[PDB]
Symmetry: C7
Subunit: 265 residues, 7 copies
Amino acid sequence: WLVANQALLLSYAVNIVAALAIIIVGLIIARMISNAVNRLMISRKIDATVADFLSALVRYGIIAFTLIAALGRVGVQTASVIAVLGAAGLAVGLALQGSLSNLAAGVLLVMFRPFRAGEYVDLGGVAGTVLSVQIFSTTMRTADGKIIVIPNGKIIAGNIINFSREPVRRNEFIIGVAYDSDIDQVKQILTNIIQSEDRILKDREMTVRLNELGASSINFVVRVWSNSGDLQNVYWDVLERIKREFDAAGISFPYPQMDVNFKRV
Amino acid sequence: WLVANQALLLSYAVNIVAALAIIIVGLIIARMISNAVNRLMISRKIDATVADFLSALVRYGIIAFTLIAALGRVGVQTASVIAVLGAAGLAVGLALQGSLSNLAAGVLLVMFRPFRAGEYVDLGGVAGTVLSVQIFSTTMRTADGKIIVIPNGKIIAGNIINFSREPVRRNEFIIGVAYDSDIDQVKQILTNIIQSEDRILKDREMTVRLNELGASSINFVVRVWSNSGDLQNVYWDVLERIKREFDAAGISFPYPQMDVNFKRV
Amino acid sequence: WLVANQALLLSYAVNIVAALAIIIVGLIIARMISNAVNRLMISRKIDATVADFLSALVRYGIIAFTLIAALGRVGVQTASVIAVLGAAGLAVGLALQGSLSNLAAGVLLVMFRPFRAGEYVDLGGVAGTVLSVQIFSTTMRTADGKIIVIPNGKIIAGNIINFSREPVRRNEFIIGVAYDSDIDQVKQILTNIIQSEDRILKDREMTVRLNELGASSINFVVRVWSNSGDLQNVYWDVLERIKREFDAAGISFPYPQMDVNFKRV
Amino acid sequence: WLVANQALLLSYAVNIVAALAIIIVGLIIARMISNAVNRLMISRKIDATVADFLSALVRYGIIAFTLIAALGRVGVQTASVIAVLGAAGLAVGLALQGSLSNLAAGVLLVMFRPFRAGEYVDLGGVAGTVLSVQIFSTTMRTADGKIIVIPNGKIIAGNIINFSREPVRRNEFIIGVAYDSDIDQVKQILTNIIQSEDRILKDREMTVRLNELGASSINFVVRVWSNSGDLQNVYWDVLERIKREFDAAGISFPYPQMDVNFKRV
Amino acid sequence: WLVANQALLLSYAVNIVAALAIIIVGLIIARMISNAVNRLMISRKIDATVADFLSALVRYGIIAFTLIAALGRVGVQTASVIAVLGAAGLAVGLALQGSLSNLAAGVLLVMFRPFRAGEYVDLGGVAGTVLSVQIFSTTMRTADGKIIVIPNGKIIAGNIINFSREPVRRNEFIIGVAYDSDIDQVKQILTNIIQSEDRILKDREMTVRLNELGASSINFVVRVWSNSGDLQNVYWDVLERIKREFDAAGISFPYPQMDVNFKRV
Amino acid sequence: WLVANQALLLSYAVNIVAALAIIIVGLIIARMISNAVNRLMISRKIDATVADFLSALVRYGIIAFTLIAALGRVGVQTASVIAVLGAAGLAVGLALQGSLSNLAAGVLLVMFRPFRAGEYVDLGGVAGTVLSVQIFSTTMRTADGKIIVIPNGKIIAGNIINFSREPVRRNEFIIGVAYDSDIDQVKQILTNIIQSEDRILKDREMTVRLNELGASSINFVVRVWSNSGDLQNVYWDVLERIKREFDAAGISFPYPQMDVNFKRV
Amino acid sequence: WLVANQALLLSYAVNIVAALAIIIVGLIIARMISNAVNRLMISRKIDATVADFLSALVRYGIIAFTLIAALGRVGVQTASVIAVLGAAGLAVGLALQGSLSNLAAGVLLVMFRPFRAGEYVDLGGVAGTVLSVQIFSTTMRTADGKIIVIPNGKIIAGNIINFSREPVRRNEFIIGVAYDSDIDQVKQILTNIIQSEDRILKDREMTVRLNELGASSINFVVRVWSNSGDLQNVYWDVLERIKREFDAAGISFPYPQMDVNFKRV
Ligand SMILES: CCCCCCCC/C=C\CCCCCCCC(=O)OC[C@H](COP(=O)(O)OCC[N+](C)(C)C)OC(=O)CCCCCCC/C=C\CCCCCCCC
Ligand SMILES: CCCCCCCC/C=C\CCCCCCCC(=O)OC[C@H](COP(=O)(O)OCC[N+](C)(C)C)OC(=O)CCCCCCC/C=C\CCCCCCCC
Ligand SMILES: CCCCCCCC/C=C\CCCCCCCC(=O)OC[C@H](COP(=O)(O)OCC[N+](C)(C)C)OC(=O)CCCCCCC/C=C\CCCCCCCC
């Protein structure tokens, strides 16, 4: 009988009063925090539907938190709701793995700087000048003139070749001449063409060596070092001069040779 | 003996009354929340069987929650049911990883805009004009006229080449002429053809250089910058004009040359 | 001594009575739920051994639940059994990841409809007409006549090219003619063949331009738009007419040309 | 002092008696369950060492469970043992992911039947007649005569082309004839050869169209529908008849043509 | 003041005595279990440093368990140590995923037997005779004579082609003859060569059909079934006999034919 | 009624006083730890916005910790907040997997040293001289002159070929001579060229053997060991000397031979 | 009022005294364990900064453990700190997955020995002699002379071909002779060359059979077994002897034959 010779009914009364207190302060704290986030988002920047589900999801989250806290305050065991809610949080955490990976990689590309804005690089077989580095992705304009947006988590997970870091780079040529050409003559013509060029650095190597005895031609290699801004112009100028002086000196560039053994008359 | 000189039977009575209370309010709250979700889904949009298992799964979920909460209120240890239920929730969370990944990537493609509707792009080797960006996927019509639906989580995880972002792009030509052709003559003909075209931008580079000494031809490169809407028309017009003026000036486009050494008479 | 001046033996007696109560109602609820699932599976649909392990696994699951709940009610700590049981549930949840992924993707392919039954599509390099979309997989008959069953989780994870969505598509031709052919003559013959075809749409583009100066031929491109049902017939008809009028007008389709420089007499 | 004016020593005595009770009933229940599993495995089927570690691992598992339950009954905190044991269970659950995935896929291949025993299929680039579908893998004999065992989790994760599902399939031919051949003559000869064959279905399409203007030959395509058992025989018969009637009608099958421009006398 | 009118100091005294009891029995049980594992490992098999860290890691594990159980018995909250220890156990469980996967696959390859010792198989593009199947890997000697050790988890995860399971296999030939050869003559010569061979099974198929009209040759196919031990010898014998009788009957094996159109005199 | 014949109101008063104490010492400890981290970051090194969100995230973390500790001290159940917070921590832990993997691999590349600064290596098909090894990545300059930044977690996960570790390496040549050349003459010329070179190590192997009977040439192999700094110079010198002495001794380097059977007069 | 008619203030006093006791013994045990690890690391082996962060991280870990144990002893709920700390431990556990995988694989490569030091093997397309097997990686010198460091977790995850395990291996030759050559003459010459070699094992197979009727040559195969140390020398000797005796017996090695049909006079 409930003749009240006990204090457990007092404990039950303070439990239901505490549950109603949790409900009403959860409602008003949800309202005030939604108002504060709504005030601090409009002043800074908003998208309409994005800020809508932002404030809505924060409000539903804090309402669900205070509702199951009030259910647990009464005496209802709420561990299944916490299990489903933790599984849903882990699902959202697996969903946002690539985005947060791009964000962490974007932080690392700002702290450590392998490349900066205006530096010709290569990011996994994609070459071009870096325009800007942002939090999720970098934009880079190629030599063709097209803009490529690459996420940061793929930038760091691969090699990042930087062309504009070292001021001195190397050209390489494969000059195929005929088998009947003199080795010393072709070598001294190529040496004169290399040493008569002022933008080829003389303190580095100036290799002119027979590299390969190919199918229809002996291939010479010539490797010269220039500044990184003069590289393509040195390539074009010395290639044109190689062609002009080999045509002037009688050295022939062979076609795809073939021997034919004639039969059946 | 049960002569009731104790209050633990009072505690057991309020436990079984509380368990029955949890059962009946779980039933009526399941009914009212199923009615409210049923009312708010018919007005907005429904598929028949989809809304059927939606309201059914929400109802079975809240019934299972209140049933094992009522079992735990009696004194039955329910941690194994919570373990299996959390494992099933983690299974469903691993199942919905790709869908929620596409949803998060679709949010990022609306906040950050690498591309918009009506902008010729390239999304992992798939080129075409973007029709619309949605929450799970984007539809884009190619130049061939076919519609391709690409999920957003694969859009962000790869490179996204944007052709219609930079207003000025570059053409490139590989003009192969014979070895006997004059370098200066071919170079000045190509320079006249480039400088006589009004849609080629004169403040950018106008490269006409000998690029390669190939197998049966010397390959010239000519690289010119045009507006992004005039690019293909400039390509076609100046290629036709290259062919006409090289035919008029005697410069030959060589066939695949070959040297034959005749033997065995 | 056990002279019973305490109520903890009363508590122990109600614990062992409660444990026996949990055991017997777990047995009879296992029997009644197995009977109800057995009755509701035979009426709807069954496979014999599949329904056998279905009802068997549900019965062993609820028996294991009530047995370790009764062990925990006595005072035996059962957290290790819950740890192994949660690990086994997570193992089964990792096992059913692909199947539930196919199920979720099959729900998304019914809500959002990129394709329907009877619509020629391409699902990751597999083309053919969709027969039916089911919960785990779609069946599609190719043009060759073979039936291909593709799981839905691989359909959504890749590109889904839809041919029968846009009513107007484009043909493309690479017509290789000889270097000696007149550009204007071949261009006006191709223009007459295009403009004399009634199933080629005249409000779209009708490109006939010199596209490429190839190895042994200049390649013209001609790109015309037709309805999606007339596309292959337009291709065949205008290709046959191109061959007939180029044979009638003296324009030659060249063979793989080659220049031979004869040596060694 | 231990003068026993308290009941906590009574509580400690019933705790150590309960711990000894847990130990001895864990021993005898381990013995009886090991005896029951040993009796039910010998009658059904056994491998010697496999059944050895099966009964051994079940016995060590239930002994470890009752030992740490008895340690927790005394008052020793056992949560670290439960943490290591749950980590080991999750390790074994990650180890058995592929096997249980093959088992779940084998259940799905028996409920849904894309293929049955004796049905020529293609399972990820592996073609052959299905012998039997089992719980972990399917065996299929190829046309070459070799037996291939494919796991089910790789069967469902890829495309499963079924050749023997549709009763009517299509042949396709690429008939390359010379440029000098008449289009109408070759087309009417191929039409007569197709319409004179009784196993080619006349209500389907009978395409005979010029498909491609290739390098050294114009390629005709002819596509005919036959029953799925007559397909290869129709292919062989009509290919032999194409060769015989093109040899009889003067239509030539060209060799790899080449134009040679003779120079250097 | 500590005038001892309470029993909580009695409770604290039995807690510190119980903690010291846990420490000393953890030490002596660690010593006895290390002695028992040390005695049962030396008799069976040991590696020196491997058994060293085995007994050492078991001893440090049981010492860490009893130390944090004794810390939790005093009143120090030890849940952070359990969190780090469970994370380390999950790290070791992720580390041993491939090894335990190979072990589970090795159990499945002994229960189910796709192959046994001395059976020519193909395990993911690796062919050879199986020497032995072990718990982590199988060793197989190829036809070249080299020993290849393949882990079991890669064996089951791929296709396992078994050559020595079916006793009857099929040979296939591509016999390319000239266009001028008679179809009936070549077909009856090949039929006589097939029917004059005693190790070719006559109840199976004996296909001799024109398969392909190739570039420079018509390709006949001949497919014959033999026993699995006579297969290569039948191949060699009937190929030599095909060459001898086609040389005797005037049928020519053509070279790579080519048509040359001579120009520029 | 609240006539205060109980001490639970005393317990509630000390709970709310303890909650306010937790709040105020959480505020001042957050302020002091933020001040201490702010003081110890400015002296050592800072980036502005990076140190901003560093101190901000530490402050919000300790404020959230003390707020939900104060909520749990009152009596509000906070296990859902801990579930969401642990899921967010696991999300951030999955996000930082690649970065911490690169950090652990960078520690292993400093403890174990497969390569050091100034040592020509190959890191997954990327060759060049190592400049420096850092905590997340190594920079290495190639022979071309470009700087490549490779993350450490990809360095250790693949092969790391080290060229500059062994002081003695081997050259290999494929010398193709004509079929009519004498084997003994070519072998003794190559042996004289090898034994007349002083930088070829004589205590190692000096192989000069006929390796291959190729399509148009017999290929000799010659394999010689030199020091690792003389390797390319030995290659170039002995290749030039091979060409000079084979031209002097009449041994011919053949072109791509071909037999032609003339038909159709 | 605090007139002290209760023992809960006594309980609070022993709680704050116990918290201070936990703090001071956590400090001195952190100091003593840091001193003991510092003493046992300097004697054995150290790197400076590595041992620095080792002792530092152990000290910060045990200080964080005793600080949050002392916070939980007071009454502050510390489950959020344990959630973040367990998430950070799981992050570090995912970071060290590859390193611990290499360590476990290195243990398996020492217990099971597929290869030892000084044994020519092939580890995933990388061949060479094993120098040493270590805990994280194996070093192996190739035949070229370069040192390759391969991690153990990639060694076990792939095939490991062992050349130096079986003492007897097999050579294989593809001898292409002309169509006009006699089959019996070439077969008996090859049989005499094989049977006149003493290092070819006579109890194994000595296959000399016509293998293939190729494009311009009939290819004979000859397969002989030798010891594993004589294999390359047998290859070279018998290949040179094949060339010498086929040149002496008039058997010709054909060039790439071609038939030419001359047209257009
Ligand atoms: C989406 C659904 C949203 C629904 C939100 C509704 C919020 C409801 C919040 C407050 C309204 C409560 C009105 C009835 C409560 C009056 C009874 C009472 O004054 O309470 C006294 C006893 C205390 O017992 P005690 O101190 O010995 O327990 C120990 C627990 N310690 C340790 C925390 C103290 O309380 C008891 O006996 C338990 C009495 C049973 C209370 C029945 C009301 C339960 C309401 C909903 C259940 C539906 C479940 C839905 C699925 C969720 C699964 C988790
Ligand atoms: C899919 C299956 C659906 C089944 C749903 C059925 C819902 C049943 C809900 C209510 C009906 C209960 C009727 C019997 C209860 C009367 C006994 C009683 O008035 O209760 C008093 C004692 C209290 O004890 P206490 O305060 O000292 O405990 C401390 C627990 N604290 C801390 C929460 C207070 O209760 C005890 O002694 C324990 C008495 C044992 C109660 C036996 C009835 C158990 C029903 C089903 C068990 C089947 C298990 C199925 C598998 C699930 C595994 C989890
Ligand atoms: C696959 C195996 C299937 C086996 C299923 C068998 C089901 C057995 C179920 C019932 C039979 C019980 C018969 C003996 C019980 C009579 C003793 C008794 O009347 O109980 C009174 C005391 C209560 O103590 P308390 O209220 O102060 O505790 C606080 C616990 N609170 C908070 C929940 C109240 O109980 C105690 O002292 C503890 C007395 C120790 C009971 C010994 C019987 C344990 C049976 C099996 C153990 C084997 C373990 C197998 C591995 C599983 C590891 C989890």
